[model samples]
Target: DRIKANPVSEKNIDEKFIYNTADFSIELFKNSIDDKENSLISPLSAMLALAMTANGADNETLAQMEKALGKDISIEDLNKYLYTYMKKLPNEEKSKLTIANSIWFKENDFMPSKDFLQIIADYYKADIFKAAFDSSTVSDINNWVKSKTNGMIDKILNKIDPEDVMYLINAVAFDAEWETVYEKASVHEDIFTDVYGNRQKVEFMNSEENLYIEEENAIGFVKPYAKNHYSFVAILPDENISVNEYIKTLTGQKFIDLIKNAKITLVRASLPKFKYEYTIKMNETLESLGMTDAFLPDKADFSKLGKSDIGNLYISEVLHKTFISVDELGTKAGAVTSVDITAAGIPVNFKTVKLNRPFIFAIIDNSTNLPIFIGTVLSL
Candidate 1:
């Protein structure tokens, strides 16, 4: 009932949101990933939770968050954009992308401002709960994450640290079927050479794709999911360039342009069967992205978010966990972005595009050409 923060404003995604959020998405991935390792980061999921927290931030703390999240769009603006964007994200029978947000604080130990909770509730559609922050909370949070992610991420919080006062979480559970499912014959065993120089036999799902993308240093393709609501993009760096090098050079504008300017032509593609989960303590990544104040004990100004009588509040830590699977039918990916305020791919082919080596991939919202979940397959 108290969830209405002056009645949710009617905000919608404008062209600026698309451009800024794209930058945020790529920046998050570039900072979070380590070469020679399989890494994934859900920029959308991370932004939602972080944005919800930023609503309560003020001064430079808020300033830093605002800049990091949207390259400088105000939090209220982002709130409106995300609210409408997620509301319109096609979650249908063939493509089920579940975006769920929540916040839970230790009962009696901390008090989140009414407007803070209401703001997140109204803009982010977050469920707010007060809990004991004990063993039960640990279980409940893990259970909540597991369920929201459809078990893609079975668990996240191993324990509720005494210092952890609140958890603002965003979970993205994406399950989508390919517009044209692969035939059984298309899947065959092949050897993949990892970034570590190790090799393993993996199943390759071959198909012919039309939306082919060409970057100066990379070549890729986008395969559509049901109704073209969502699609998977896989990019293979040139033999002379490493995945990291290619990623480092990628810009939000350039990346989006790649998707939009994709050539409509047939290309042979071969993607491997890959399923993996990624967990990162994103304090460093966000810091590297210019959001340094939130994690500092003395520097953070989250008075707008909430406060504790015992301690001035600052984000204790940030945790991000992600899971994804790609195969003949489609793609299923889950990411849980939560702030202590802790925080936080594919393949194939054509012109004979084969993911026999490490590559980059993303499950993107076609309408926006923005990757909700993006990462790399460095090994395995």
Candidate 2:
């Protein structure tokens, strides 16, 4: 029913921007994080750009720098690499909103080239960067995050060495209104299942005669977006189905097919409104993705962080966190990407996995299939 009224558009701008952070001392870092087989290189390219800038690298030096990191990457190649990945990433059809930002690192209390800042800002087509220049203090960085994240995330920036060549910060924030904002009067406390199979009382929303879809082991619905050609899809599994198991068995393509094949009907929908946040340290996550050598100080040869031939290059720290609220008003989500640019100028990677449950998800596109935001609900 809802699908016929709101068909997919071809001119969406959901995943149009690119953000990067990396360290020059580690070349193989490129080989890591990036799923070469899948050609998902946007995430990896953004990190690589951060590392290159942290090392204060120029085009000529980057040619040499590429060798040190692991591959011979040219400026053209780097740009092409990112272009390929960005083109493949789909704007999720379930997330209602998303925001992203990036920062360039420098050592002095000076401002970066305005053109450079503008370049990044234009990429995301959103006010991605809140604090640039002024003071490169960690507090300033943290405040920017708080403002964009609606105070859900705090103190995301760690130590900042303004003198360490240059650094880049990347962040994304998002929010989506439930197609059918649950009425407050309909809210009631109910039992929720925990990870350990324990039950707890939680606030759940109740509604009836909404858009619905029935699949193999799950039911789906289209939560319309406020203003755009996007919507959120809530896939509730059958009692006999395991959320994790279903996800494992599903791929992006299959998920797309499910949306296309959905047969709508009247649905008595009951959902819970909840807020979740995670301040994650991505060291282990990056390692799991294949990046390990870039974080080593000795092994890092970031002579680019300074004019001198420095060698103590490694990821001093990588701190990232995301916050989201799901309710009748909609979904708001934000992410902060901060990295400590070591003297060697290497990019450290991080990953978070709080999304470990069966829940609601959405993908936002303008009028095109370009993705703006995508997210999964793990808890109420």
Candidate 3:
């Protein structure tokens, strides 16, 4: 989902940081098949990205590391842990997984107004499909995700809002999964058809596959990467159909149906190897998706954050970037990153997408998706 902010507050700062970090982590894990050589930073890089955003790290600094290495970065210690973990994996197994990431954030002036906070709270409750509680609401949300994910998402957002914070917004998501689960390992060489119908020789795994079936457009299967928390779900169309066009119709209900229909089967599964990257200016996309009012300069209203009533509250910019790679094995590594900067304390609001890329995001009310606080990862 997407959110805007007005009169950013210390609470928004802390909340933004925590929310962005978790979001990025989940997104990274989703499309992590291209990360060979343990090069793509997983949880570690996600933490670092959030930390930089939260601490107001300079873009120039990020660029320096980017220049030094072809890819972004992961912190020092997190890199060590991944290397060690990779060493334990069978060499061939490690080569099959890929990695990608997304990050998103925003900067603002002071505390968010009532309307802004209500929307943010609604975002967590609704998008995550959870309820509100007492002092541990942040922990509750994190724990709920962890439980559904089976603990692949390890970190708990201990603190959503911190004291004395100025301007902050942070989000990170990561995902990595085996290309195919090792149920009944049988390797077969197959030809995969590209958009042009050309075929390529690739290794495919055959097993009793459990796939989520849909009648009209696509079929899906879950490939557990590290465990349940992070998995790769593949949505393929019926023969001679457009996967891209079909994916456009996806929604939360569609996902629910797909999951419900999934049944275990002994079949021949042939997958492929590929890597991709995506950078999106989400403002237009969100506007196209029926959220024009939030980004409108005049129509927008965000008086909930503070006493000031500024009519200039609209989403001036929205940027999202993500990277992912897939191979014969499960996700090797992945990351999700995002960034958002506004002119002032006008409340902001918006929504995001699934296939667009692993993204770090936020959700404020329709009035203003202003920052209550922000959160990011300092290290893995």
lDDT of each: 0.82, 0.47, 0.34
Best by lDDT: 1
Expressed as tens digits, the lDDT of each residue in 34-111 for candidate 3 is 212112333333333323222221233333322222122332322332333222322222232222222211122333
Question: Stretches of candidate 1 above 4 Å error?
Answer: 1-7, 192-199, 242-244, 341-357, 378-380
For every candidate, C-alpha RMSD to the true structure in Å: 6.0, 10.5, 17.2
Task: Please give, for residues 194-295, the per-residue lDDT of candidate 1 as tens digits.
Answer: 555778778888999999999888899999999879999999878786644666788888888999999999999988788888887777788888998888
lDDT of 2 by residue, 57-152 (tens): 443344443444334454334434433333444345444233444454443433344444443433432232333433455677777668755566
Q: Model 2 compared with the native: what TM-score?
A: 0.60
- Please give the RMSD of candidate 3 to the true structure: 17.2
Q: Work out the TM-score per prediction.
A: 0.92, 0.60, 0.43
* Most TM-score-accurate candidate: 1
**1 against 3, candidate with superior lDDT:** 1
lDDT of 2: 0.47
